[PDB]
Design an enzyme around this catalytic site. Structure first.
Site, mmCIF file in Angstrom:
data_model
loop_
_atom_site.group_PDB
_atom_site.id
_atom_site.type_symbol
_atom_site.label_atom_id
_atom_site.label_comp_id
_atom_site.label_asym_id
_atom_site.label_seq_id
_atom_site.Cartn_x
_atom_site.Cartn_y
_atom_site.Cartn_z
ATOM 1 N N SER A 228 0.788 -1.241 0.014
ATOM 2 C CA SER A 228 0.016 -0.094 0.203
ATOM 3 C C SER A 228 0.869 1.160 -0.173
ATOM 4 O O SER A 228 1.634 1.442 0.855
ATOM 5 C CB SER A 228 -0.962 -0.067 1.188
ATOM 6 O OG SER A 228 -1.583 -1.204 1.450
ATOM 7 N N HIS B 41 -8.906 -0.210 -9.854
ATOM 8 C CA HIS B 41 -7.971 1.008 -10.165
ATOM 9 C C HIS B 41 -7.109 1.207 -8.898
ATOM 10 O O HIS B 41 -7.565 1.785 -8.029
ATOM 11 C CB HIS B 41 -8.792 2.090 -10.285
ATOM 12 C CG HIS B 41 -10.117 1.831 -10.944
ATOM 13 N ND1 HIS B 41 -11.192 1.457 -10.262
ATOM 14 C CD2 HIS B 41 -10.789 1.329 -12.309
ATOM 15 C CE1 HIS B 41 -12.324 0.878 -11.202
ATOM 16 N NE2 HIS B 41 -11.998 1.001 -12.257
ATOM 17 N N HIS C 158 -5.451 -9.404 -0.199
ATOM 18 C CA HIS C 158 -5.304 -9.480 1.394
ATOM 19 C C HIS C 158 -6.311 -10.657 1.733
ATOM 20 O O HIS C 158 -7.608 -10.555 1.044
ATOM 21 C CB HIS C 158 -5.529 -8.393 2.037
ATOM 22 C CG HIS C 158 -4.619 -7.268 1.673
ATOM 23 N ND1 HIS C 158 -4.650 -6.476 0.436
ATOM 24 C CD2 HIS C 158 -3.529 -6.536 2.491
ATOM 25 C CE1 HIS C 158 -3.977 -5.484 0.790
ATOM 26 N NE2 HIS C 158 -3.125 -5.679 1.755
ATOM 27 N N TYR D 135 -7.928 -10.667 4.318
ATOM 28 C CA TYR D 135 -9.270 -9.733 4.822
ATOM 29 C C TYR D 135 -10.144 -9.235 3.815
ATOM 30 O O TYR D 135 -10.964 -8.306 4.213
ATOM 31 C CB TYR D 135 -8.778 -8.674 6.034
ATOM 32 C CG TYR D 135 -7.953 -7.506 5.106
ATOM 33 C CD1 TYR D 135 -6.395 -7.250 5.535
ATOM 34 C CD2 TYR D 135 -8.609 -6.602 4.447
ATOM 35 C CE1 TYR D 135 -5.884 -6.223 4.979
ATOM 36 C CE2 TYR D 135 -7.785 -5.578 3.712
ATOM 37 C CZ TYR D 135 -6.524 -5.539 4.057
ATOM 38 O OH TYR D 135 -5.764 -4.514 3.362
ATOM 39 N N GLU D 136 -9.947 -9.533 2.663
ATOM 40 C CA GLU D 136 -10.614 -8.814 1.767
ATOM 41 C C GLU D 136 -11.770 -10.165 1.212
ATOM 42 O O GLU D 136 -12.550 -9.653 0.445
ATOM 43 C CB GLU D 136 -10.197 -8.237 0.541
ATOM 44 C CG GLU D 136 -9.195 -7.180 0.372
ATOM 45 C CD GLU D 136 -8.387 -6.821 -0.713
ATOM 46 O OE1 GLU D 136 -7.054 -6.722 -0.447
ATOM 47 O OE2 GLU D 136 -8.990 -6.712 -1.595
ATOM 48 N N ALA E 211 3.350 -2.418 4.042
ATOM 49 C CA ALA E 211 3.045 -1.321 4.945
ATOM 50 C C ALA E 211 2.965 -1.985 6.196
ATOM 51 O O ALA E 211 1.811 -2.103 6.607
ATOM 52 C CB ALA E 211 2.490 -0.218 4.549
ATOM 53 N N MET F 189 -0.870 -7.276 7.131
ATOM 54 C CA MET F 189 -1.704 -8.197 6.815
ATOM 55 C C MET F 189 -1.863 -9.018 5.434
ATOM 56 O O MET F 189 -2.623 -9.360 4.810
ATOM 57 C CB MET F 189 -3.040 -7.581 6.838
ATOM 58 C CG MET F 189 -3.381 -6.854 8.209
ATOM 59 S SD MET F 189 -4.735 -5.547 8.415
ATOM 60 C CE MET F 189 -4.102 -4.529 9.778
ATOM 61 N N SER F 190 -0.312 -9.122 4.935
ATOM 62 C CA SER F 190 -0.039 -9.660 3.730
ATOM 63 C C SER F 190 1.658 -10.247 3.584
ATOM 64 O O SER F 190 2.216 -10.428 4.835
ATOM 65 C CB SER F 190 -0.394 -8.554 2.787
ATOM 66 O OG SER F 190 0.143 -7.410 3.090
ATOM 67 N N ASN G 60 3.930 3.629 10.560
ATOM 68 C CA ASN G 60 3.658 3.857 12.014
ATOM 69 C C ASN G 60 4.185 2.923 13.060
ATOM 70 O O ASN G 60 5.173 2.284 12.703
ATOM 71 C CB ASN G 60 2.088 4.007 11.942
ATOM 72 C CG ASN G 60 1.541 2.697 11.084
ATOM 73 O OD1 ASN G 60 2.181 1.898 10.577
ATOM 74 N ND2 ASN G 60 0.054 2.407 11.228
ATOM 75 N N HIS H 49 -5.009 5.061 10.813
ATOM 76 C CA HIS H 49 -4.872 4.613 9.569
ATOM 77 C C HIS H 49 -4.407 5.841 8.745
ATOM 78 O O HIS H 49 -3.441 5.534 7.948
ATOM 79 C CB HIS H 49 -5.791 3.794 9.027
ATOM 80 C CG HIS H 49 -5.373 3.588 7.285
ATOM 81 N ND1 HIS H 49 -4.497 2.817 7.191
ATOM 82 C CD2 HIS H 49 -6.051 4.268 6.163
ATOM 83 C CE1 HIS H 49 -4.192 2.856 5.886
ATOM 84 N NE2 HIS H 49 -5.276 3.578 5.255
HETATM 85 N N1 LIG Z 1 -1.203 -4.868 11.322
HETATM 86 C C1 LIG Z 1 -0.796 -3.612 10.855
HETATM 87 N N2 LIG Z 1 -0.584 -2.727 11.972
HETATM 88 C C2 LIG Z 1 -0.158 -1.276 11.850
HETATM 89 O O1 LIG Z 1 0.076 -0.851 12.745
HETATM 90 C C3 LIG Z 1 0.206 -0.984 10.534
HETATM 91 N N3 LIG Z 1 0.345 0.356 9.966
HETATM 92 N N4 LIG Z 1 0.349 -0.076 8.603
HETATM 93 N N5 LIG Z 1 0.182 -1.261 8.333
HETATM 94 C C4 LIG Z 1 -0.177 -1.797 9.500
HETATM 95 N N6 LIG Z 1 -0.581 -3.158 9.825
#
Ligand SMILES: Nc1nc(O)c2[nH]nnc2n1
Ligand SMILES: Nc1nc(O)c2[nH]nnc2n1
Ligand SMILES: Nc1nc(O)c2[nH]nnc2n1
Lengths: 288, 288, 288
Positions: free
Chosen positions: B32, B63, B85, B87-88, B115, B218-219, B242, B256
């Site tokens: 991402s 897209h 992913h 989760y989708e 990410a 998550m991937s 983060n 997020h």
């Molecule tokens: N699981 C997870 N946790 C965070 O804190 C994240 N930041 N960016 N992707 C993220 N995925």
């Protein structure tokens, strides 16, 4: 996510609304043994899960599987008596389904209760643990009620859970326990959801101790996740019905018939407490 | 495994091959925010997942869900822009499906990006973590892209993962960062896949710290597992967007919209780095 | 639970009973490489999983996927040669299906065997680990053979597992090893089920070490859970076929062809041991 769609939650919300004079503000999911709280309701209206349009019906219980409205301590409630669990076969998007309708019913706060095992040594069976955090074990693996396409109508794709149990209400909770001038102080720990129906082994309890968990259970987490996803104030308690973590002579090692934590006794207490707590839940009237 | 069959990966590989002049050597899954790397391609050919025969199509994106070929720093690439992913809703055998076709397309190296969250304290949001290892949480429970009957055509039943991130390329990576004479050194840690779409709680982040993880996502893990299963050189980076792990006053606790790690800024950097890295990936020409 | 129903286990139990003169008391699930124990049987009767009414058939093996009856050291046995695993695609309620029929066949004790990885440092590949406990990782997430509506005909909703490996038989086991006056003492540790077919990474092995596990495998746990659920004496051993947990120069890091633990050699030993052990399993005759 799956299986249901928005009109599904929309037809059910409406069916209920157009079948009850009540418009709940607070939704209360009672844990095993805590179904008694329903008695505290007034002007109550009992719907059978069975009765409600897309509502998952119970696998075995049913009776101890009803949705009752009414009022609790000055709060328009809706208590789900007999919550669904992943171990009954319900996909998590059926487990948490009710929460999604409570939101469309106007519910803004969700107080969930449960009956865990006592991991933390300081706990004494009977204790009531305020849930300050949770460890979503089934979630780590894929079992998250949010999995599937995100419905921005309800919320985000990646909702955060670091704020799940609303600081405020936890405060008002710790205070309230003190107001009542109680015995054992309202405990406070992390609840670890563990899916399976069988009970943890000594070896398992220890990993739960190491992980950080304080109490182990097979529910709540799913309802907390989607509730938060909708933007619902969430707080809850965990009736400690037992405890274990010792190979070195199991001695008792539980069974389940052991889970009751002085049944009537403690169950009654956590119930009155929740009821007293209705007064500490912000009224949609903004209050001022 | 399930759902697809060999001719499925064989019809798709062929469809692509017979629809592109390109024959990719390196397949690059962009995380991402890292989809920008596609811009660095030349002689590029953009296919829509939608377009390709058995290719899972995107749940929402589309897209920012395209498959672009072309060239990067002297390597015939194929960058999947917008990875799938769990989760989708995608079963892991759809998530990792692309990797299985990249192998039949002739791809021999797979560089995956993602990410994550910053678990390790030393990390500073913006940092780029070279993935040296991974902790496959969904795998422990059953969620492994290899589950189902093994296709010896692709690989073994019990492929090992202790060697997943190719020592060589990790070396050439640490060196390259140094060649460029950069600021914060190319980080290096273990990536922990966590399925769910919601973000970890403080209580969860701590178990991830204790487990050994350095970054949470998550991937990636699914693509790394089957890539290795095919015998594909695999290496990858994790843009630290983060970080968190603190009850004792959450303060920020993410959301997020916080994930961006100086978006354009850092995303651009990890991208150029990967591109520079094309020169350190053994050419099928054996080179000598 | 799912997929099968009581008459399903009842038609199969009967089909077998009405197709064999034998009425097994002990059911023995042989792990990979331990299928040899079948040779030790006398008056043996080999049924093909394929042959038996609702019995899951093998995904690949088949041949090294047969159900043989007969006798072992004075115990009417029934050895499942070639156990089912979740990673072959079998839902856990197919994996553990046999155990549910063994119970209806009259089996009262279940001795399971397997081939794990050596997590505990003290272990030496070749060692035989008596399983004293287990950590059900897939269970934590939802993958528990009991998930679904509980069949009180077989057992409880929340059976306990803290007592799974029968203290008695473990004693008689440690003693027996000593009777034989053996070399390396019968090891004893916790077995951690890990689903996936691929092998753990160094980063994963370490979390398995931290969790408390002593040996890692992809089976047994499911059979132990439902066996206990039926009220079956359960005990088992784990042939340590290898070991790892080191980034700092992997050196060997396994492969699988490494798993054999002196194949014939050790496999033969754990087998004779189990056979000797038939004499320490309470006879339904109450014995007195
Ligand atoms: N699981 C997870 N946790 C965070 O804190 C994240 N930041 N960016 N992707 C993220 N995925
Ligand atoms: N998982 C779990 N474990 C215990 O020990 C319990 N006691 N009551 N509910 C319980 N749930
Ligand atoms: N999970 C697992 N890991 C190892 O290292 C093994 N060796 N033999 N079976 C094994 N199973």
């Amino acid at each position: 996510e799956n299986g249901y769609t928005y009109e599904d939650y929309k037809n059910t919300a409406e069916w209920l609304l157009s079948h009850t004079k009540h418009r709940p503000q607070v939704a209360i999911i009672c844990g095993s043994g805590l179904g008694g709280l329903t008695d505290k309701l007034t002007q109550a209206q009992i719907f059978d899960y069975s009765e409600i349009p897309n509502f998952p019906r119970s696998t075995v219980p049913g009776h101890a599987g009803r949705l009752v409205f009414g009022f609790l301590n000055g709060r328009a409630c809706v208590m789900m008596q007999g919550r669904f669990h992943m171990y009954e076969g319900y996909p998590l998007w059926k487990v948490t389904f009710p929460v999604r309708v409570f939101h469309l019913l106007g519910v803004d706060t969700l107080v969930v209760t449960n009956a865990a095992g006592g991991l933390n040594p300081k706990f004494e069976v009977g204790d009531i643990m305020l849930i300050r955090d949770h460890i979503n074990l089934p979630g780590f693996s894929g079992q998250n009620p949010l999995r599937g396409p995100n419905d921005e109508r309800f919320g985000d794709r990646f909702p955060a859970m670091s704020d799940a149990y609303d600081r405020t209400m936890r405060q008002r909770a710790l205070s309230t326990w003190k107001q009542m001038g109680e015995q054992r102080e309202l405990q406070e720990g992390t609840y670890v959801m563990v899916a399976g129906p069988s009970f943890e082994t000594v070896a398992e309890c220890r990993v739960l101790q190491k992980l950080g968990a304080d109490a182990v259970g097979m529910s709540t987490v799913p309802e907390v996740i989607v509730a938060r996803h909708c933007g619902l104030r969430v707080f809850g308690f965990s009736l400690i019905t037992n405890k274990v973590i010792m190979d070195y002579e199991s001695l008792e090692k539980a069974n389940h018939e052991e889970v009751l934590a002085a049944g009537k006794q403690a169950a009654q207490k956590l119930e009155q407490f929740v009821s007293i707590l209705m007064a500490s839940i912000p009224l949609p009237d903004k209050a001022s």
